[PDB]
Amino acid sequence: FITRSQAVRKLQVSLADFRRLCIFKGIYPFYYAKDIQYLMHEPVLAKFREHKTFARKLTRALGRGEVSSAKRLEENRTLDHIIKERYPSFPDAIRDIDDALNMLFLFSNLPSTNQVSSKIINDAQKICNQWLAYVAKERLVRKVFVSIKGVYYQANIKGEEVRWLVPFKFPENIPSDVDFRIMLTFLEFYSTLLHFVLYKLYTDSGLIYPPKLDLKKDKIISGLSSYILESRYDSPVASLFSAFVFYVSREVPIDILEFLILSCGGNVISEAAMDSKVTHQIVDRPVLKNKVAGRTYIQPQWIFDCINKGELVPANKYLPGEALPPHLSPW
């Protein structure tokens, strides 16, 4: 048995690069001697050393005072084949996609900062939007759980029952304790895997990939509903609210509610969207000053309970301002 020090000495690789290789190979710790020998042949290590040498070359070019040379060196410069061996079959990738989805959702809400490139945040947001569009089109969601740390969304992709957490839309705190470098390396692999899986699903059974954002709608209603795509009943969650227009007040976020209703098959319009067959409306204010009978005023909890049950329970214990019933875990 060898240790991390011996592996680093033999591989002649940096600590960060060593951690990246271990993550890409899942070499859990002492370290597996029989696996380090196989790790001795790795094109990723060759690419890392080439990039390290290119960094020194670029520093030399900058020091010599030649912008054109630096530009040429920078322009003249993957995990695709790594996934081939660590995910033997699609079901395993689907099962392990929980962590990738959670990381992407968490990073999509992270504000841009010096420690995290804005491009990474944009890519994470795009991946999350693509995943939301795919889920809505397939209506594979079966249960919804709301928690203090977010909404514990889950999907039944091929019966996997994956549970992906959706963080609340709020300014995310940035504690210095978390090392973004490791998080960035994890996010890169997770994003590549999610892109591969989304492309495969879209081509095999889904829609055109990659989907393009609705430019006209992206100016006003950017989000899940701002996506346009085209192709080329198994649960109540895919049949509830059929053709029902579920209005939403300004208090509740349309992005969360719109996803569920669109997956079920209904429609959602928010008062702030403009900034009709309005059969239902959601209100959370202490006083229903509007006091309109045309729009059925029901607390949003009934949508979650109906989705988790499927019987379209009436608004008995859902009146505006009325205490909601306990949200018992469906598991």
Binding site: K149, Y152, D179
Partner: protein, 96 residues
């Protein structure tokens, strides 16, 4: 024009040939840590003080259950990043 190829293709076999692929140990379902949980799990001031007394690494119950009849009343959560970072660290930084 990248990623336009079936990475997996036809495949119906698992890693059972080499049993070193430890299970990811994905987190189990929730335990009533909802924004509107049963009133019996409404942490009392004494229970809240006891929970606050415990420090990190000894908080198996890592949530303070509370009832919020209004969605707007839900407070913001800033510890999500730290908890998931700890999970990522523990994913591969533990002997197996």
């Amino acid at each position: 024009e990248n990623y336009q190829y079936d990475l997996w293709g036809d495949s119906t076999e698992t890693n059972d040939h080499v049993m070193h692929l430890r299970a990811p140990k994905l987190p189990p379902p929730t335990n009533e840590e909802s924004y509107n949980p049963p009133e019996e799990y409404l942490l009392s001031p004494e229970e809240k003080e006891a929970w606050e007394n415990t420090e990190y690494s000894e908080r198996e119950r890592n949530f303070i259950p509370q009832k919020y009849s209004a969605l707007r009343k839900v407070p913001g959560y800033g510890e999500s990043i730290r908890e998931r970072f700890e999970r990522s660290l523990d994913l591969y930084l533990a002997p197996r």
